[PDB]
Design an enzyme around this catalytic site. Structure first.
Site, short mmCIF file in Angstrom:
data_model
loop_
_atom_site.label_atom_id
_atom_site.label_comp_id
_atom_site.label_asym_id
_atom_site.label_seq_id
_atom_site.Cartn_x
_atom_site.Cartn_y
_atom_site.Cartn_z
N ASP A 135 -30.17 -9.83 -0.15
CA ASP A 135 -30.24 -8.74 0.81
C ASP A 135 -29.38 -9.03 2.04
OD1 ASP A 135 -31.03 -6.21 1.66
OD2 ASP A 135 -32.96 -6.89 2.47
N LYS A 137 -26.79 -8.24 4.73
CA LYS A 137 -26.37 -7.02 5.40
C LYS A 137 -26.38 -7.29 6.88
CE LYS A 137 -31.08 -5.11 5.17
NZ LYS A 137 -31.91 -3.89 4.95
N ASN A 140 -29.50 -8.20 8.84
CA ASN A 140 -30.08 -9.50 8.55
C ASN A 140 -29.19 -10.67 8.99
OD1 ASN A 140 -32.41 -8.47 7.43
ND2 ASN A 140 -31.67 -8.59 5.33
N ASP A 153 -34.17 -13.26 6.85
CA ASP A 153 -34.81 -12.37 5.84
C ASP A 153 -34.72 -12.94 4.43
OD1 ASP A 153 -34.72 -8.79 4.92
OD2 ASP A 153 -36.42 -10.13 5.19
N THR A 175 -30.76 -3.71 -0.65
CA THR A 175 -30.57 -2.51 0.16
C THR A 175 -29.43 -1.76 -0.48
OG1 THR A 175 -31.36 -3.60 2.16
CG2 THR A 175 -29.92 -1.70 2.46
N1 LIG Z 1 -35.64 -14.97 14.53
C1 LIG Z 1 -35.49 -13.85 15.26
N2 LIG Z 1 -34.99 -13.81 16.52
C2 LIG Z 1 -34.86 -12.61 17.15
N3 LIG Z 1 -35.19 -11.41 16.57
C3 LIG Z 1 -35.69 -11.38 15.31
C4 LIG Z 1 -35.85 -12.62 14.56
N4 LIG Z 1 -36.36 -12.33 13.35
C5 LIG Z 1 -36.48 -10.99 13.30
N5 LIG Z 1 -36.08 -10.43 14.46
C6 LIG Z 1 -36.08 -8.99 14.77
O1 LIG Z 1 -37.33 -8.48 14.37
C7 LIG Z 1 -37.11 -7.42 13.43
C8 LIG Z 1 -38.31 -7.35 12.51
O2 LIG Z 1 -38.17 -8.40 11.58
P1 LIG Z 1 -39.12 -8.46 10.31
O3 LIG Z 1 -38.59 -9.56 9.42
O4 LIG Z 1 -40.56 -8.43 10.77
O5 LIG Z 1 -38.87 -7.02 9.61
P2 LIG Z 1 -37.51 -6.33 9.05
O6 LIG Z 1 -36.80 -7.32 8.16
O7 LIG Z 1 -36.75 -5.71 10.21
O8 LIG Z 1 -38.08 -5.03 8.29
P3 LIG Z 1 -38.54 -4.90 6.75
O9 LIG Z 1 -39.34 -6.18 6.54
O10 LIG Z 1 -39.39 -3.65 6.76
O11 LIG Z 1 -37.22 -4.84 6.02
C9 LIG Z 1 -35.77 -7.73 12.78
O12 LIG Z 1 -35.17 -6.54 12.27
C10 LIG Z 1 -35.00 -8.30 13.94
O13 LIG Z 1 -34.42 -7.25 14.71
#
Ligand SMILES: Nc1ncnc2c1ncn2[C@@H]1O[C@H](COP(=O)(O)OP(=O)(O)OP(=O)(O)O)[C@@H](O)[C@H]1O
Ligand SMILES: Cc1cccc(C)c1OCCSc1nc2ccccc2n1CC(=O)O
Ligand SMILES: Cc1cccc(C)c1OCCSc1nc2ccccc2n1CC(=O)O
Length: 289
Positions: A135, A137, A140, A153, A175
């Site tokens: 995934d 992109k 991520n 991710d 995706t």
């Molecule tokens: N390590 C990090 N540092 C800063 N921001 C982060 C970090 N990890 C995630 N984020 C932010 O938090 C958001 C939410 O992350 P999360 O992994 O909970 O869900 P997602 O991957 O966005 O959504 P889904 O799981 O529904 O695809 C991310 O899209 C990113 O913008």
């Protein structure tokens, strides 16, 4: 040997929500005893059990615990309480690469080259460990305070078995804009599936949108399988050549794949002539504007 004691929620002062996913929330936290900042990803046990997401959460922990490279978000610790699971992650202060693509519209050649090289370097590391991301992109690909990439991710990633010399993985994940033709047709992904996604990302850095686009998934799938895309005017010619060598329907013919003799020939592509591969994470990134 022993490890630091397991952390607990009360060891932190929680701050702002950094983002929300379908079954997770990421919150900025300061650890009281050290004053260090972490991005803490929090999941509710009841919810992940009810929604059959346990395998994804376990996958994310297992895959991230294996990673030790500067271009990946780091998993420092994990813990739980009666209701929740917690991942302690590095905080990527500058957020998603996607945000910069949208703000700027089109990266210049120097910035495209630098960020592409960082992604290639990351993928070389990941593939060397037998791990497929699946995934990849711009959402991520996060950016740290110094504007280096931090790929994240990993709940949909796969560790290929070295024991069976496994090359292909059978879970349908990803995706639509970035999914590979082999996943759509053969219903399996391989390391080369990430190289397809790379080609889409390079295209998007220059063009402002990924190559296969439409208002819904099925239409995008149809375009992918037919290799239905075109380049805009002024697309940097060496970058175009590189994209054309990654967006190849046959997964065994993509530059960088195992059947094309790996990352050496990819890193040798003329688009990267001026890149010093050895120490990218210590080089100062070019300014985006
Ligand atoms: N390590 C990090 N540092 C800063 N921001 C982060 C970090 N990890 C995630 N984020 C932010 O938090 C958001 C939410 O992350 P999360 O992994 O909970 O869900 P997602 O991957 O966005 O959504 P889904 O799981 O529904 O695809 C991310 O899209 C990113 O913008
Ligand atoms: C995976 C899982 C999901 C729902 C409910 C429970 C009870 C559960 O087991 C947790 C046991 S250990 C564990 N698995 C994790 C997966 C992701 C993040 C934290 C994690 N921790 C707690 C820990 O590592 O300390
Ligand atoms: S939303 C959005 N904002 C943009 C700004 C520049 C180029 C494309 C852009 N898109 C669409 C997208 O990201 O798919």
């Amino acid at each position: 040997p022993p490890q630091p004691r397991k952390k607990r929620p009360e060891d932190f002062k929680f701050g702002k929500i950094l983002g929300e996913g379908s079954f997770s929330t990421v919150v900025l936290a300061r650890e009281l005893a050290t004053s260090r900042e972490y991005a803490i990803k929090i999941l509710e046990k009841r919810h992940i059990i009810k929604e059959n997401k346990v395998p994804y959460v376990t996958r994310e922990r297992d895959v991230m615990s294996r990673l030790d490279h500067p271009f990946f978000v780091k998993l420092y610790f994990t813990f739980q309480d009666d209701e929740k699971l917690y991942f302690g992650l590095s905080y990527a202060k500058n957020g998603e690469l996607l945000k910069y693509i949208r703000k700027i519209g089109s990266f210049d050649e120097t910035c495209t080259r630098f960020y592409t090289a960082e992604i290639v370097s990351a993928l070389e590391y990941l593939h060397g460990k037998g791990i497929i991301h699946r995934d990849l992109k711009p959402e991520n690909i996060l950016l740290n305070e110094d504007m280096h990439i931090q790929i994240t991710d990993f709940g949909t990633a796969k560790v290929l078995s070295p024991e069976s010399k496994q090359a292909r993985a059978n879970s349908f994940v990803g995706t639509a804009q970035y999914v590979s033709p082999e996943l759509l047709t053969e219903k399996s992904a391989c390391k080369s599936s990430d190289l397809w996604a790379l080609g889409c990302i390079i295209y998007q850095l220059v063009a402002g949108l990924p190559p296969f686009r439409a208002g819904n998934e099925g239409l995008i799938f149809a375009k992918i399988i037919k290799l239905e895309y075109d380049f805009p005017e002024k697309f940097f010619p060496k970058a175009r050549d590189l994209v054309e060598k990654l967006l190849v329907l046959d997964a065994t013919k993509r530059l960088g794949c195992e059947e094309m003799e790996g990352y050496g020939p990819l890193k040798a592509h003329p688009f990267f002539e001026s890149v010093t591969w050895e120490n990218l994470h210590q080089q100062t990134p070019p300014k985006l504007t």
